[PDB]
Amino acid sequence: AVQKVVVHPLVLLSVVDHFNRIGKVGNQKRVVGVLLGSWQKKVLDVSNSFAVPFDEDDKDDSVWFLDHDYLENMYGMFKKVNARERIVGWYHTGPKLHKNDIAINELMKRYCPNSVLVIIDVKPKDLGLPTEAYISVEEVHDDGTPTSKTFEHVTSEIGAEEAEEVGVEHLLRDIKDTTVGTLSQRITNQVHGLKGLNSKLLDIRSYLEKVATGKLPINHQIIYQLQDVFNLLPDVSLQEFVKAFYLKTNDQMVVVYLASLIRSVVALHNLINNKIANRDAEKKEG
């Protein structure tokens, strides 16, 4: 149904406010906020959101506390001031997906339309993208397990339309723009290996742990496609790609001729002014 979503940083800075208005009490649980957006178009666009007092139990996980009057009053007044945005779903700040999320999401599945779920981290130490759109749809399983709520990962992007780019750029004054060239390219080409190294290294360790020490079926069926796609590149002998290395290396030669020739053109004004300025300033100094 929905291919991609658009999440503005305003809601995540509202999660910064979720971490600001705590009051130093010692709970810091998965505070659930009422996510708002535009479900009209096929693409989802989050503009702003708000929160609702949400408290769980220490031992029992099935305890969840929501509010209907606060949702209808905040949504009623928010719709009165801005009717272009309506309820879409919710989101929790907890890093782990608990079992009670089917009951928490089930309320906004009954009263509200199909709600999207977003899992983020309480500490911004994760290098990866903090936002993951999880659609709440029921899927048929091939093994015969009963139909239940399944959270499929929907791709997400963090973009601002008109003003939040200006506000973020003015508040930071440290981040740089695209700036195609040497630095913005070589930084990605340096740290990219760590950007994949922390993800893969962080995932395959617990993966290999759950291979031998795993039960409660983790959908082992998708592991066959995992190792299949991993074995779709069986160390090609590079025999056919030699001519492609001749093409890319020939373009490399083109960049060699462009650099040497163009820089040789740049040497004109320098290697002329260095003489005509020094000898004339010297002969005319005294």
């Binding site: 782990k96 608990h98 590149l233 492609a244």
Partner: protein, 152 residues
């Protein structure tokens, strides 16, 4: 109809000879088969151009697969002369066979292995393979990472 639908397996028409014969013999259904063969030459054109039409259509089906069926051996399995196979190639030159490769020494044909420009063909294949491995690797990795959360 199911054999003529798609994925036409290379089979002998001798099994269809008795099927068409009994198709002319039985009168319970499709009775006007003798009316199909009413004219002395029209039915012969429908039959020769029919077997020709399926013996070209199966070539158009196996032409999608690059398995290199080695039509020199296929002419032996079909039990027909290579001259009317050259006439079949005379039907392929008007059937847009321009994307093919022939051999002067041998008789094996090639429906693939073009000049293969690395900036277009290997570019496209490497794009779909590498990118497909990247995003496909991206989906079930974190998806399974969410599947293992329910075990706690």
């Amino acid at each position: 109809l199911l054999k003529l639908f798609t994925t036409m397996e290379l089979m002998r028409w001798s099994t269809l000879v008795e099927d068409y014969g009994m198709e002319l013999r039985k009168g319970s259904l499709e009775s006007p088969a003798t009316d199909v063969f009413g004219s002395t030459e029209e039915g012969e054109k429908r039959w020769k151009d029919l077997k020709n039409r399926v013996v070209e259509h199966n070539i158009r089906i196996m032409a999608k697969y690059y398995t290199r069926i080695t039509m020199k051996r296929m002419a032996q399995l079909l039990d027909l002369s290579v001259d009317e196979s050259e006439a079949f190639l005379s039907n392929l030159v008007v059937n847009k066979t321009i994307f093919a490769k022939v051999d002067r020494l041998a008789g094996i044909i090639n429906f693939q292995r073009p000049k293969d420009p690395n900036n277009l063909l290997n570019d496209w294949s490497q794009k779909l393979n590498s990118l497909m491995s990247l995003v496909n690797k991206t989906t079930h990795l974190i998806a399974k990472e969410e599947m293992i959360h329910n075990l706690q």
